[PDB]
Amino acid sequence: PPVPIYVKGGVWTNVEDQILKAAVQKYGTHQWSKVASLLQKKTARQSELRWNEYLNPKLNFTEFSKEEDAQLLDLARELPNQWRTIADMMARPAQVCVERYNRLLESLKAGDINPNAETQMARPDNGDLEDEEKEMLAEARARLLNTQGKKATRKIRERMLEESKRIAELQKRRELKQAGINVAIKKPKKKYGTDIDYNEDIVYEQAPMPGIYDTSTEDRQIKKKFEQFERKVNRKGL
């Protein structure tokens, strides 16, 4: 129901630059197809060009100093029109270098495809938005939200369902207790032959290896306190 966009080179707007930035923060630099899937009407290579040429904060967009500018005239003299090598020598993007070289030596129609669109300035947007851009930001927030797998999401669901299942299981017992028939709570079943129930025994009980001092009366005081707590939970209910 969208007709297919076969050629996806366009003009970079503001929306796509900002979604590319908030996608590179989460997805990282070397996954480009997963970045460019987040914003339609652009390609994984054109996302890579828009990062490495324009949106990168390491890139040097300032005015040229006088030593920089004389260095540019000399390097453009020595290396004839090898602009990637020159731009590597200046730590500046190559499009900046070419346009500033044109400004030194000086002293698009409609219906054309612009090849240099990734290196050029963005277009700010009309005031409300377009509808497809509303859809783009909605699905982009939806894909930047999730940090879980299938197993973990199913675990969230299973914990909630077991919780509500226990609540219903206690509800019926409280109703039958009001009626006067005391159904004891059934236990979960063991999945294997030596699966351990944890109210029968202290399961790996380690005694504290007695010393020189005497602990009879403190034992009696603890035993009194615990017996009284269990009786109070039986009568009054915590």
């Binding site: 929306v15 944890y198 001092y213 005081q221 269990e230």
Partner: protein, 211 residues
């Protein structure tokens, strides 16, 4: 206006959005113990889970299970000091002083080079006002050649007890356990504060002839 920070504020705000008898208590307990023993059968390490599971058995007012859990927690990792301190405190807060005395004994005899354990046992015996035990504890604690924090603590103890005759005996061993001039000068300043001219003079002479 749209920027990446406003997108991520929207994403953050989006993703941010009855025991009545004893049988319900036993079911709550069985379920929670299956939980904790599962996460400790899988990861034998992670002392924080051991302390939380021990605190759970403290909240159930069952002290024997909490003791067994703390002992099983020490068998994995005896080098871990906050576990020793929780188990001593978990004895003390329920007013079981002899269990914690046995425990502080086993702690300072297991790890004698750890300073905080001896000081814990000294706090506990001060708080109960047992001055003979605190003197005996600092006596053994000074006997093992500890370091100057232990010695300054013992000279402060015997200042607070106003046993003026004993502080000279402590410094007379402390100038041999640590020979510097700062220890001789500490005994100098004590003899100027709480001694005669003649004692301070003899202390100075005993300094200078050995030097």
């Amino acid at each position: 206006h749209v920027s990446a920070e406003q997108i991520l504020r929207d994403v953050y705000k989006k993703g941010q959005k009855d025991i009545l008898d004893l049988e319900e208590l036993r079911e709550y307990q069985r379920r929670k113990r299956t939980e904790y023993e599962g996460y400790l059968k899988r990861n034998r390490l992670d002392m924080g889970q051991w302390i939380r599971y021990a605190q759970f058995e403290i909240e159930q007012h069952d002290m024997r299970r909490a003791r067994s859990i703390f002992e099983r927690a020490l068998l994995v990792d005896s080098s871990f000091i906050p576990l020793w301190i929780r188990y001593i405190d978990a004895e003390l807060k329920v007013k079981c002083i002899n269990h914690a005395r046995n425990l502080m004994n086993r702690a300072i005899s297991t790890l004698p080079r750890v300073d905080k354990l001896w000081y814990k046992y000294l706090i506990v015996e001060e708080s109960l006002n047992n001055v003979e035990i605190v003197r005996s504890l600092y006596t053994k604690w000074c006997s093992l050649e500890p370091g100057v924090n232990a010695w300054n603590s013992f000279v402060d103890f015997e200042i607070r007890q106003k046993n003026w005759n004993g502080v000279r005996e402590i410094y007379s061993k402390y100038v041999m356990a640590h020979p510097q001039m700062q220890t001789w000068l500490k005994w100098v300043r004590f003899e100027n504060r709480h001694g005669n001219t003649e004692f301070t003079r003899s202390v100075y002479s005993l300094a200078i002839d050995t030097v």
